Motif scaffolding. Sequence first.
Motif, PDB file in Angstrom:
ATOM      1  N   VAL A  55       1.532 -10.924   1.878  1.00  0.00           N
ATOM      2  CA  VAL A  55       1.910 -11.322   3.255  1.00  0.00           C
ATOM      3  C   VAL A  55       1.209 -12.644   3.604  1.00  0.00           C
ATOM      4  CG1 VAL A  55       2.510  -8.965   4.031  1.00  0.00           C
ATOM      5  CG2 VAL A  55       0.188  -9.748   4.348  1.00  0.00           C
ATOM      6  N   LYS A  58      -0.634  -8.162   9.356  1.00  0.00           N
ATOM      7  CA  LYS A  58      -1.465  -6.997   8.970  1.00  0.00           C
ATOM      8  C   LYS A  58      -0.757  -6.221   7.871  1.00  0.00           C
ATOM      9  CE  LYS A  58      -3.124  -6.954  13.524  1.00  0.00           C
ATOM     10  NZ  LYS A  58      -2.685  -6.261  14.767  1.00  0.00           N
ATOM     11  N   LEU A  59      -1.449  -5.943   6.771  1.00  0.00           N
ATOM     12  CA  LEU A  59      -0.828  -5.170   5.677  1.00  0.00           C
ATOM     13  C   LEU A  59      -1.735  -4.019   5.226  1.00  0.00           C
ATOM     14  CD1 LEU A  59      -0.087  -6.000   2.040  1.00  0.00           C
ATOM     15  CD2 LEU A  59       1.403  -4.803   3.675  1.00  0.00           C
ATOM     16  N   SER A  60      -1.128  -2.856   5.103  1.00  0.00           N
ATOM     17  CA  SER A  60      -1.884  -1.694   4.527  1.00  0.00           C
ATOM     18  C   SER A  60      -0.948  -1.172   3.421  1.00  0.00           C
ATOM     19  CB  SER A  60      -2.356  -0.647   5.460  1.00  0.00           C
ATOM     20  OG  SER A  60      -1.347   0.063   6.111  1.00  0.00           O
ATOM     21  N   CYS A  61      -1.578  -0.624   2.364  1.00  0.00           N
ATOM     22  CA  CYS A  61      -0.835  -0.105   1.184  1.00  0.00           C
ATOM     23  C   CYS A  61      -1.479   1.237   0.848  1.00  0.00           C
ATOM     24  CB  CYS A  61      -0.813  -1.003  -0.057  1.00  0.00           C
ATOM     25  SG  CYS A  61       0.088  -2.525   0.370  1.00  0.00           S
ATOM     26  N   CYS A  62      -0.640   2.242   0.523  1.00  0.00           N
ATOM     27  CA  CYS A  62      -1.193   3.606   0.329  1.00  0.00           C
ATOM     28  C   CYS A  62      -0.485   4.247  -0.888  1.00  0.00           C
ATOM     29  CB  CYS A  62      -1.104   4.384   1.638  1.00  0.00           C
ATOM     30  SG  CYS A  62       0.579   4.525   2.309  1.00  0.00           S
ATOM     31  N   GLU A  63      -1.257   5.201  -1.411  1.00  0.00           N
ATOM     32  CA  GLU A  63      -0.890   5.784  -2.716  1.00  0.00           C
ATOM     33  C   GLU A  63      -0.640   7.263  -2.687  1.00  0.00           C
ATOM     34  OE1 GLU A  63      -2.234   1.746  -3.089  1.00  0.00           O
ATOM     35  OE2 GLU A  63      -3.326   1.918  -4.979  1.00  0.00           O
ATOM     36  N   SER A  64       0.146   7.736  -1.700  1.00  0.00           N
ATOM     37  CA  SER A  64       0.515   9.163  -1.652  1.00  0.00           C
ATOM     38  C   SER A  64       1.905   9.254  -0.983  1.00  0.00           C
ATOM     39  CB  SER A  64      -0.510  10.041  -0.990  1.00  0.00           C
ATOM     40  OG  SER A  64      -0.750   9.718   0.373  1.00  0.00           O
ATOM     41  N   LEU A 100      -5.348   7.858  -0.428  1.00  0.00           N
ATOM     42  CA  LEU A 100      -6.051   6.580  -0.330  1.00  0.00           C
ATOM     43  C   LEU A 100      -5.149   5.531   0.335  1.00  0.00           C
ATOM     44  CD1 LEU A 100      -8.478   4.733  -1.096  1.00  0.00           C
ATOM     45  CD2 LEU A 100      -7.236   4.114  -3.183  1.00  0.00           C
ATOM     46  N   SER A 101      -5.658   4.820   1.316  1.00  0.00           N
ATOM     47  CA  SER A 101      -4.986   3.659   1.909  1.00  0.00           C
ATOM     48  C   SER A 101      -6.017   2.490   1.849  1.00  0.00           C
ATOM     49  CB  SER A 101      -4.470   3.736   3.349  1.00  0.00           C
ATOM     50  OG  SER A 101      -5.574   4.006   4.197  1.00  0.00           O
ATOM     51  N   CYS A 102      -5.522   1.288   1.645  1.00  0.00           N
ATOM     52  CA  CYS A 102      -6.333   0.049   1.617  1.00  0.00           C
ATOM     53  C   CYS A 102      -5.625  -0.964   2.565  1.00  0.00           C
ATOM     54  CB  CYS A 102      -6.498  -0.538   0.233  1.00  0.00           C
ATOM     55  SG  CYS A 102      -7.364   0.782  -0.761  1.00  0.00           S
ATOM     56  N   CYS A 103      -6.422  -1.772   3.248  1.00  0.00           N
ATOM     57  CA  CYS A 103      -5.820  -2.745   4.168  1.00  0.00           C
ATOM     58  C   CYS A 103      -6.585  -4.056   4.124  1.00  0.00           C
ATOM     59  CB  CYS A 103      -5.788  -2.083   5.538  1.00  0.00           C
ATOM     60  SG  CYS A 103      -7.385  -1.508   6.159  1.00  0.00           S
ATOM     61  N   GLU A 104      -5.893  -5.149   4.436  1.00  0.00           N
ATOM     62  CA  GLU A 104      -6.525  -6.455   4.307  1.00  0.00           C
ATOM     63  C   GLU A 104      -6.653  -7.261   5.585  1.00  0.00           C
ATOM     64  OE1 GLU A 104      -3.945  -7.924   1.141  1.00  0.00           O
ATOM     65  OE2 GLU A 104      -2.848  -9.180   2.562  1.00  0.00           O
TER      66      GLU A 104
END
Lengths: 62, 62
Positions: free
Chosen positions: A46, A51-57, B52-56
């Motif tokens: 981006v 604002k960016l969030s990425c999740c693994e479920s 798990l979530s990650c954000c920047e």
Amino acid sequence: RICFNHQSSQPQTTKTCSPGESSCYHKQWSDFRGTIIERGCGCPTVKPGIKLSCCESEVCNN
Amino acid sequence: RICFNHQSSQPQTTKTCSPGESSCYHKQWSDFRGTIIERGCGCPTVKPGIKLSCCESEVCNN
């Protein structure tokens, strides 16, 4: 992996991701409509300030 | 980057991340004690079954 793909406050909807895609994302910015949220499969790059969030479920990006 | 580092519902606290770190994380699971949330800098690996979530962006992991 199944991720939400609805925009902002629209009714929840989902997308079945490609094989081996394991992320979902939430992207947020503002328009002259208010707060805008984009959702989907993957974890995009981006522009700064977005604002960016990425999740693994499963369906983790509400 | 500044990230929240407080556990579950404890009072908000933050951690100043190492130079170059751009992400914060949010890790959550449930056990016979409720929903447990761990927060901090970076985006760590996790065991299967842990969310798990990650954000920047600053203090994005509440």
